[PDB]
């Protein structure tokens, strides 16, 4: 009924959208992993009379449900998708997208990691993002590689028309008490990577984490704080 939808509010298999700004939505789905249920976010950005998708909904069936929810709520075709790192909450569902007419993209680093680990593999490589601080334009967004954080390949996405910063899993929500799933993380480099995001996007108005509630710029400092303390 208007609040940001939360883990116990979304059965696994169902997807919700949340309007962030004009032409910008997040998508929220839930999935089971190792016997616990988690929410996760992605982004939808209006690209004229088409849509750009950022990240899958964490699984094939969730991603099919995402497409159906977009058709119901927005009614414009998803033509391209970008996955912001190689994990299943970002690429699981790429095969569904690829069979629904969507062109799927990720950095070569993400594609390699996804292939090596047995995750679904986006079709197209995004060059120009291999060094920290690199940025490229992709439709209505800018893609930015901040350096290693949650993963070595993680990308962030900025929507300049709306000053929306989608941090993906490199950014944690304010209620976070831990650095999340750190299996593939670089806790030593993570604060430096967050500082790069802070420096590059000082005018961000909304910051969206990979999991949990959006907020403002404080999510970046909070993330740095919880990762440093986790490492400690
Ligand atoms: C799919 C994703 C994943 C699964 C379950 C939970 C999370 C969380 C999470 C847990 N808690 N929270 C709340 C913290 N604010 C978020 C985050 C996040 O942190 O992005 N990703 C998660 N995988 C699995 C993997 C283990 C590796 C294979 N050995 C690959 O690593 C990784 O990320
Ligand atoms: Zn991850
Ligand atoms: Zn994640």
GROMACS .gro file of N, CA, C and O in nm, residues 24-93:
model
  280
   24UNK      N    1   1.176   0.594  -1.333
   24UNK     CA    2   1.267   0.507  -1.262
   24UNK      C    3   1.189   0.426  -1.160
   24UNK      O    4   1.116   0.484  -1.077
   25UNK      N    5   1.202   0.294  -1.166
   25UNK     CA    6   1.139   0.205  -1.070
   25UNK      C    7   1.247   0.112  -1.015
   25UNK      O    8   1.345   0.081  -1.083
   26UNK      N    9   1.230   0.066  -0.893
   26UNK     CA   10   1.299  -0.055  -0.850
   26UNK      C   11   1.205  -0.173  -0.867
   26UNK      O   12   1.082  -0.158  -0.869
   27UNK      N   13   1.265  -0.292  -0.880
   27UNK     CA   14   1.193  -0.417  -0.872
   27UNK      C   15   1.242  -0.496  -0.752
   27UNK      O   16   1.360  -0.490  -0.720
   28UNK      N   17   1.151  -0.564  -0.685
   28UNK     CA   18   1.178  -0.635  -0.561
   28UNK      C   19   1.122  -0.776  -0.572
   28UNK      O   20   1.005  -0.795  -0.609
   29UNK      N   21   1.205  -0.873  -0.542
   29UNK     CA   22   1.164  -1.013  -0.543
   29UNK      C   23   1.228  -1.083  -0.424
   29UNK      O   24   1.313  -1.027  -0.356
   30UNK      N   25   1.185  -1.205  -0.398
   30UNK     CA   26   1.246  -1.279  -0.288
   30UNK      C   27   1.287  -1.417  -0.335
   30UNK      O   28   1.233  -1.474  -0.430
   31UNK      N   29   1.388  -1.469  -0.270
   31UNK     CA   30   1.441  -1.599  -0.309
   31UNK      C   31   1.498  -1.668  -0.186
   31UNK      O   32   1.542  -1.604  -0.092
   32UNK      N   33   1.499  -1.800  -0.193
   32UNK     CA   34   1.557  -1.888  -0.093
   32UNK      C   35   1.702  -1.915  -0.133
   32UNK      O   36   1.733  -1.932  -0.251
   33UNK      N   37   1.792  -1.916  -0.035
   33UNK     CA   38   1.931  -1.951  -0.059
   33UNK      C   39   1.985  -2.011   0.069
   33UNK      O   40   1.978  -1.947   0.175
   34UNK      N   41   2.037  -2.133   0.062
   34UNK     CA   42   2.089  -2.199   0.181
   34UNK      C   43   1.990  -2.197   0.299
   34UNK      O   44   2.028  -2.189   0.415
   35UNK      N   45   1.864  -2.212   0.268
   35UNK     CA   46   1.764  -2.231   0.371
   35UNK      C   47   1.718  -2.104   0.440
   35UNK      O   48   1.659  -2.112   0.548
   36UNK      N   49   1.746  -1.988   0.383
   36UNK     CA   50   1.690  -1.864   0.433
   36UNK      C   51   1.635  -1.785   0.315
   36UNK      O   52   1.676  -1.802   0.199
   37UNK      N   53   1.541  -1.697   0.344
   37UNK     CA   54   1.475  -1.617   0.241
   37UNK      C   55   1.523  -1.474   0.249
   37UNK      O   56   1.531  -1.415   0.357
   38UNK      N   57   1.552  -1.417   0.133
   38UNK     CA   58   1.605  -1.283   0.125
   38UNK      C   59   1.533  -1.204   0.018
   38UNK      O   60   1.496  -1.260  -0.087
   39UNK      N   61   1.516  -1.073   0.037
   39UNK     CA   62   1.472  -0.986  -0.072
   39UNK      C   63   1.591  -0.945  -0.155
   39UNK      O   64   1.706  -0.955  -0.113
   40UNK      N   65   1.563  -0.901  -0.278
   40UNK     CA   66   1.667  -0.834  -0.354
   40UNK      C   67   1.604  -0.734  -0.448
   40UNK      O   68   1.489  -0.750  -0.488
   41UNK      N   69   1.680  -0.631  -0.483
   41UNK     CA   70   1.637  -0.522  -0.571
   41UNK      C   71   1.701  -0.531  -0.710
   41UNK      O   72   1.813  -0.582  -0.726
   42UNK      N   73   1.634  -0.471  -0.805
   42UNK     CA   74   1.691  -0.430  -0.931
   42UNK      C   75   1.630  -0.297  -0.972
   42UNK      O   76   1.557  -0.234  -0.893
   43UNK      N   77   1.657  -0.252  -1.095
   43UNK     CA   78   1.615  -0.121  -1.141
   43UNK      C   79   1.550  -0.135  -1.279
   43UNK      O   80   1.586  -0.222  -1.358
   44UNK      N   81   1.459  -0.043  -1.308
   44UNK     CA   82   1.397  -0.028  -1.439
   44UNK      C   83   1.405   0.119  -1.473
   44UNK      O   84   1.363   0.203  -1.391
   45UNK      N   85   1.454   0.153  -1.592
   45UNK     CA   86   1.469   0.292  -1.630
   45UNK      C   87   1.404   0.311  -1.767
   45UNK      O   88   1.437   0.241  -1.863
   46UNK      N   89   1.312   0.407  -1.776
   46UNK     CA   90   1.247   0.435  -1.903
   46UNK      C   91   1.347   0.495  -2.002
   46UNK      O   92   1.421   0.586  -1.968
   47UNK      N   93   1.344   0.441  -2.124
   47UNK     CA   94   1.443   0.464  -2.233
   47UNK      C   95   1.357   0.498  -2.355
   47UNK      O   96   1.337   0.417  -2.445
   48UNK      N   97   1.295   0.616  -2.354
   48UNK     CA   98   1.200   0.655  -2.458
   48UNK      C   99   1.070   0.576  -2.448
   48UNK      O  100   0.997   0.586  -2.349
   49UNK      N  101   1.039   0.497  -2.551
   49UNK     CA  102   0.926   0.405  -2.545
   49UNK      C  103   0.970   0.263  -2.520
   49UNK      O  104   0.894   0.168  -2.543
   50UNK      N  105   1.091   0.245  -2.470
   50UNK     CA  106   1.141   0.116  -2.427
   50UNK      C  107   1.186   0.126  -2.281
   50UNK      O  108   1.193   0.235  -2.224
   51UNK      N  109   1.227   0.013  -2.224
   51UNK     CA  110   1.278   0.006  -2.087
   51UNK      C  111   1.415  -0.059  -2.086
   51UNK      O  112   1.436  -0.159  -2.157
   52UNK      N  113   1.502  -0.006  -2.001
   52UNK     CA  114   1.629  -0.067  -1.966
   52UNK      C  115   1.612  -0.133  -1.829
   52UNK      O  116   1.567  -0.070  -1.733
   53UNK      N  117   1.650  -0.259  -1.820
   53UNK     CA  118   1.646  -0.335  -1.696
   53UNK      C  119   1.785  -0.345  -1.637
   53UNK      O  120   1.881  -0.376  -1.708
   54UNK      N  121   1.796  -0.324  -1.506
   54UNK     CA  122   1.920  -0.349  -1.432
   54UNK      C  123   1.893  -0.465  -1.338
   54UNK      O  124   1.812  -0.450  -1.245
   55UNK      N  125   1.962  -0.576  -1.363
   55UNK     CA  126   1.961  -0.698  -1.281
   55UNK      C  127   1.833  -0.778  -1.296
   55UNK      O  128   1.723  -0.727  -1.314
   56UNK      N  129   1.849  -0.910  -1.290
   56UNK     CA  130   1.737  -1.002  -1.286
   56UNK      C  131   1.668  -0.995  -1.150
   56UNK      O  132   1.712  -0.927  -1.057
   57UNK      N  133   1.559  -1.071  -1.137
   57UNK     CA  134   1.487  -1.084  -1.012
   57UNK      C  135   1.527  -1.208  -0.933
   57UNK      O  136   1.449  -1.255  -0.851
   58UNK      N  137   1.648  -1.259  -0.955
   58UNK     CA  138   1.702  -1.371  -0.874
   58UNK      C  139   1.629  -1.500  -0.901
   58UNK      O  140   1.565  -1.556  -0.811
   59UNK      N  141   1.642  -1.550  -1.022
   59UNK     CA  142   1.589  -1.678  -1.061
   59UNK      C  143   1.505  -1.668  -1.186
   59UNK      O  144   1.446  -1.563  -1.216
   60UNK      N  145   1.494  -1.781  -1.257
   60UNK     CA  146   1.417  -1.786  -1.380
   60UNK      C  147   1.269  -1.754  -1.358
   60UNK      O  148   1.212  -1.667  -1.426
   61UNK      N  149   1.205  -1.821  -1.263
   61UNK     CA  150   1.062  -1.795  -1.245
   61UNK      C  151   1.038  -1.655  -1.192
   61UNK      O  152   0.945  -1.585  -1.236
   62UNK      N  153   1.122  -1.608  -1.100
   62UNK     CA  154   1.106  -1.471  -1.054
   62UNK      C  155   1.121  -1.372  -1.170
   62UNK      O  156   1.051  -1.270  -1.177
   63UNK      N  157   1.213  -1.399  -1.262
   63UNK     CA  158   1.239  -1.307  -1.372
   63UNK      C  159   1.125  -1.309  -1.474
   63UNK      O  160   1.087  -1.206  -1.528
   64UNK      N  161   1.065  -1.427  -1.498
   64UNK     CA  162   0.943  -1.431  -1.578
   64UNK      C  163   0.832  -1.349  -1.512
   64UNK      O  164   0.759  -1.274  -1.579
   65UNK      N  165   0.819  -1.362  -1.381
   65UNK     CA  166   0.720  -1.283  -1.309
   65UNK      C  167   0.749  -1.133  -1.316
   65UNK      O  168   0.656  -1.053  -1.323
   66UNK      N  169   0.878  -1.096  -1.315
   66UNK     CA  170   0.917  -0.958  -1.331
   66UNK      C  171   0.868  -0.903  -1.464
   66UNK      O  172   0.810  -0.795  -1.471
   67UNK      N  173   0.893  -0.977  -1.572
   67UNK     CA  174   0.846  -0.932  -1.703
   67UNK      C  175   0.695  -0.912  -1.705
   67UNK      O  176   0.645  -0.814  -1.761
   68UNK      N  177   0.622  -1.006  -1.646
   68UNK     CA  178   0.477  -0.993  -1.641
   68UNK      C  179   0.435  -0.872  -1.560
   68UNK      O  180   0.340  -0.803  -1.597
   69UNK      N  181   0.501  -0.845  -1.447
   69UNK     CA  182   0.466  -0.730  -1.366
   69UNK      C  183   0.496  -0.600  -1.438
   69UNK      O  184   0.421  -0.503  -1.427
   70UNK      N  185   0.607  -0.594  -1.512
   70UNK     CA  186   0.638  -0.476  -1.592
   70UNK      C  187   0.530  -0.453  -1.697
   70UNK      O  188   0.487  -0.340  -1.720
   71UNK      N  189   0.486  -0.560  -1.764
   71UNK     CA  190   0.382  -0.542  -1.864
   71UNK      C  191   0.253  -0.490  -1.803
   71UNK      O  192   0.186  -0.403  -1.860
   72UNK      N  193   0.218  -0.540  -1.684
   72UNK     CA  194   0.097  -0.499  -1.616
   72UNK      C  195   0.106  -0.353  -1.572
   72UNK      O  196   0.009  -0.280  -1.583
   73UNK      N  197   0.217  -0.312  -1.512
   73UNK     CA  198   0.228  -0.183  -1.444
   73UNK      C  199   0.279  -0.071  -1.534
   73UNK      O  200   0.250   0.046  -1.508
   74UNK      N  201   0.359  -0.104  -1.636
   74UNK     CA  202   0.427  -0.005  -1.719
   74UNK      C  203   0.387  -0.018  -1.865
   74UNK      O  204   0.354   0.081  -1.931
   75UNK      N  205   0.390  -0.139  -1.918
   75UNK     CA  206   0.339  -0.162  -2.050
   75UNK      C  207   0.429  -0.122  -2.165
   75UNK      O  208   0.382  -0.108  -2.278
   76UNK      N  209   0.558  -0.103  -2.139
   76UNK     CA  210   0.659  -0.078  -2.238
   76UNK      C  211   0.755  -0.195  -2.243
   76UNK      O  212   0.775  -0.263  -2.142
   77UNK      N  213   0.813  -0.223  -2.359
   77UNK     CA  214   0.895  -0.343  -2.372
   77UNK      C  215   1.033  -0.325  -2.312
   77UNK      O  216   1.098  -0.221  -2.330
   78UNK      N  217   1.077  -0.428  -2.241
   78UNK     CA  218   1.216  -0.433  -2.194
   78UNK      C  219   1.302  -0.477  -2.312
   78UNK      O  220   1.283  -0.585  -2.365
   79UNK      N  221   1.395  -0.391  -2.353
   79UNK     CA  222   1.477  -0.423  -2.470
   79UNK      C  223   1.620  -0.461  -2.436
   79UNK      O  224   1.683  -0.532  -2.514
   80UNK      N  225   1.673  -0.414  -2.324
   80UNK     CA  226   1.811  -0.439  -2.286
   80UNK      C  227   1.814  -0.458  -2.135
   80UNK      O  228   1.733  -0.399  -2.063
   81UNK      N  229   1.910  -0.539  -2.090
   81UNK     CA  230   1.934  -0.556  -1.948
   81UNK      C  231   2.083  -0.553  -1.923
   81UNK      O  232   2.161  -0.605  -2.004
   82UNK      N  233   2.122  -0.500  -1.807
   82UNK     CA  234   2.260  -0.502  -1.759
   82UNK      C  235   2.261  -0.574  -1.625
   82UNK      O  236   2.179  -0.540  -1.538
   83UNK      N  237   2.353  -0.668  -1.608
   83UNK     CA  238   2.376  -0.731  -1.480
   83UNK      C  239   2.498  -0.669  -1.413
   83UNK      O  240   2.603  -0.658  -1.477
   84UNK      N  241   2.485  -0.634  -1.285
   84UNK     CA  242   2.587  -0.555  -1.217
   84UNK      C  243   2.692  -0.638  -1.146
   84UNK      O  244   2.791  -0.580  -1.102
   85UNK      N  245   2.673  -0.768  -1.130
   85UNK     CA  246   2.782  -0.860  -1.096
   85UNK      C  247   2.734  -1.000  -1.130
   85UNK      O  248   2.623  -1.021  -1.178
   86UNK      N  249   2.819  -1.100  -1.103
   86UNK     CA  250   2.801  -1.233  -1.157
   86UNK      C  251   2.712  -1.326  -1.075
   86UNK      O  252   2.688  -1.438  -1.120
   87UNK      N  253   2.667  -1.285  -0.958
   87UNK     CA  254   2.589  -1.372  -0.871
   87UNK      C  255   2.447  -1.392  -0.923
   87UNK      O  256   2.396  -1.316  -1.004
   88UNK      N  257   2.383  -1.497  -0.870
   88UNK     CA  258   2.250  -1.537  -0.916
   88UNK      C  259   2.144  -1.434  -0.895
   88UNK      O  260   2.046  -1.434  -0.971
   89UNK      N  261   2.157  -1.347  -0.796
   89UNK     CA  262   2.060  -1.241  -0.776
   89UNK      C  263   2.074  -1.130  -0.881
   89UNK      O  264   1.993  -1.037  -0.879
   90UNK      N  265   2.172  -1.139  -0.971
   90UNK     CA  266   2.196  -1.042  -1.076
   90UNK      C  267   2.185  -1.102  -1.215
   90UNK      O  268   2.141  -1.031  -1.307
   91UNK      N  269   2.225  -1.228  -1.232
   91UNK     CA  270   2.223  -1.294  -1.362
   91UNK      C  271   2.124  -1.410  -1.368
   91UNK      O  272   2.097  -1.459  -1.478
   92UNK      N  273   2.072  -1.458  -1.255
   92UNK     CA  274   1.981  -1.573  -1.262
   92UNK      C  275   1.848  -1.527  -1.317
   92UNK      O  276   1.779  -1.444  -1.254
   93UNK      N  277   1.812  -1.574  -1.436
   93UNK     CA  278   1.704  -1.514  -1.512
   93UNK      C  279   1.748  -1.455  -1.643
   93UNK      O  280   1.663  -1.423  -1.727
   0.00000   0.00000   0.00000
